[PDB]
Amino acid sequence: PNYALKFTLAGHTKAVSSVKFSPNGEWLASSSADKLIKIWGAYDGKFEKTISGHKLGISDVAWSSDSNLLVSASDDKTLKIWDVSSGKCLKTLKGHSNYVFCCNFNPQSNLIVSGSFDESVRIWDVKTGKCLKTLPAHSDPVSAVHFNRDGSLIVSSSYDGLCRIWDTASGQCLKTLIDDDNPPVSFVKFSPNGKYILAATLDNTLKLWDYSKGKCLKTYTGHKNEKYCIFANFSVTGGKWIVSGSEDNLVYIWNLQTKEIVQKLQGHTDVVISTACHPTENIIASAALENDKTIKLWKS
Ligand SMILES: C[C@H](NC(=O)[C@H](CCCNC(=N)N)NC(=O)[C@H](C)NC(=O)[C@@H](N)CO)C(=O)NCc1ccc(/N=N/c2ccc(CO)cc2)cc1
């Protein structure tokens, strides 16, 4: 593949924590330590609007499946749901007793999952803003939470070194993924077809798990990840890649099945905390920490 820099997006006055393409493919949303959400044109990199409300910085942000709603996870121990077009804050989800780190809508977008430094995972009702469930998920901060394709499953990861898979409806743990040693898991998500999960660990290692068999299938290295919870992705619109940020300021792209680094992206001046893949085009968004403060758009 041949991702080349097309756009640099400037505006956040602090570190960007997370970037996400809207499912309809028209927008990019960005979260920052500057307590703000910014929305950008996915194709032209053009600034669109600021969404504000959080009392502290934001670690994560997620789109509903109809691109109308945003959820954001903040250090002010709350989530807020946002009507994107109007800018309204529709609900504030309160219940976490520490930094909310990660969040996600289910496909049906009637639920939100959140993971927190209170070591718990919570399931929220979108429409009412009420917490449906609280799972005793981990013995250390929750780094990532994610629904599978049909929303039946949740996967969560944690500095405790574990990935657990949860039944959305009943809240019971269906599986604990554990390998030959448990370095902290910094990131986790299902593959789009929901057959696999990708997990990132603070030992400079990406791992592709077959979660039904419960066996680790592929491993992806060469990048540097010993400290931050760096988002990683499946790119599936062109070839099949793994895409991850890295603490050496590069964006890394691997061939999924042969595991070879096929492209390193240059440009950022600080840790690439976050990357995102466009739902229908060969586009990547990447974002960096305090010394860089920019978002880059790469097209292939
Ligand atoms: C701005 C950025 N924020 C974060 O790295 C994370 C969210 C990263 C992306 N979000 C996601 N993956 N869901 N958030 C935070 O650190 C805190 C909770 N919140 C904020 O910073 C917000 N203001 C904005 O995100 C940051 O640099 N925080 C400071 C920091 C300090 C130490 C650290 N790990 N340091 C270590 C970790 C482990 C070890 C030994 O194992 C040693 C050092 C990791 C981060």
Swiss-Prot record:
Effect annotated for changing F101D = Strongly reduced affinity for histone H3
Where is this protein found? Nucleus
Keywords attached to this Swiss-Prot or TrEMBL record, sorted alphabetically, are: Acetylation, Chromatin regulator, Host-virus interaction, Isopeptide bond, Nucleus, Repeat, Transcription, Transcription regulation, Ubl conjugation, WD repeat
Q: Which GO terms describe its molecular function?
A: histone binding; histone H3K4 methyltransferase activity; histone H3K4me1 reader activity; histone H3Q5ser reader activity
Q: What is the effect of changing F231A?
A: Strongly reduced affinity for histone H3. Significant decrease in interaction with KMT2A
Effect listed in the UniProt record for changing T176M: Found in a patient with childhood apraxia of speech; uncertain significance
Q: What is this protein called?
A: WD repeat-containing protein 5
Q: What is the lineage of its organism?
A: Eukaryota, Metazoa, Chordata, Craniata, Vertebrata
